[PDB]
Design an enzyme around this catalytic site. Structure first.
Site, short mmCIF file in Angstrom:
data_model
loop_
_atom_site.label_atom_id
_atom_site.label_comp_id
_atom_site.label_asym_id
_atom_site.label_seq_id
_atom_site.Cartn_x
_atom_site.Cartn_y
_atom_site.Cartn_z
N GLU A 1 1.01 -1.06 -0.49
CA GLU A 1 0.35 -0.14 0.03
C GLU A 1 0.93 1.26 0.30
OE1 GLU A 1 -3.41 -0.30 -0.46
OE2 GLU A 1 -3.82 -1.89 0.10
N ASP B 1 -6.97 6.77 -4.46
CA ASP B 1 -6.43 5.48 -5.02
C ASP B 1 -6.56 4.65 -6.32
OD1 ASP B 1 -8.71 3.84 -5.53
OD2 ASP B 1 -9.39 3.54 -3.03
#
Ligand SMILES: [Cl-]
Ligand SMILES: [Cl-]
Length: 162
Positions: free
Chosen positions: A11, A20
């Site tokens: 991440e 994202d």
């Protein structure tokens, strides 16, 4: 290597609100703030989550605090889930980290939906599970991360992360 280090690799760390892969407003270590297009709804959620007026920016500690809560919620979500639990109980510690990664990424519901794969994971049919997991939007959307998680699941080793 452990789940935390595995996820921080997958991440990244961002101290400023960002979008994202899917386009959602996220912050810190994969912490989804909202699926709402508004950057203002994002700042709101962010402020709520942190307990302060952030203006879209957080400290490293704050990002780590959020991450600890999320991995925790991820594990508890797995153990509370009638579809997930049995699979997890049946796994060795490496493969467990794999399922945890998935749930952190796609939510409990998401993963719970991988019916067939969960079944092969349970029956310890590694290769077949790996092949079935790859036939997903997940894999197509984020191929490198998915390949990593999938190999961890297939193999029970941390190679893909080494
Ligand atoms: Cl939160
Ligand atoms: Cl990727």
């Amino acid at each position: 290597m452990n789940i935390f280090e595995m996820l921080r690799i997958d991440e990244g760390l961002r101290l400023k609100i960002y979008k994202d892969t899917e386009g959602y407003y996220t912050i810190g270590i994969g912490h989804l703030l909202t699926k709402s297009p508004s950057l203002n709804a994002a700042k709101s959620e962010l402020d709520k989550a942190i307990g302060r007026n952030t203006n879209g920016v957080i400290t490293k500690d704050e990002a780590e605090k959020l991450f600890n809560q999320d991995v925790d919620a991820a594990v508890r979500g797995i153990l509370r889930n009638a579809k997930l639990k049995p699979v997890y109980d049946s796994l060795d510690a490496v493969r467990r980290a794999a399922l945890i990664n998935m749930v952190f990424q796609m939510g409990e519901t998401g993963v719970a939906g991988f019916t067939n794969s969960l079944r092969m994971l349970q029956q310890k049919r590694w290769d077949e599970a790996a092949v079935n997991l790859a036939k997903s939007r997940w894999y197509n959307q984020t191929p490198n991360r998915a390949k990593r998680v999938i190999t961890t699941a297939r193999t029970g080793t941390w190679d893909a992360y080494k």
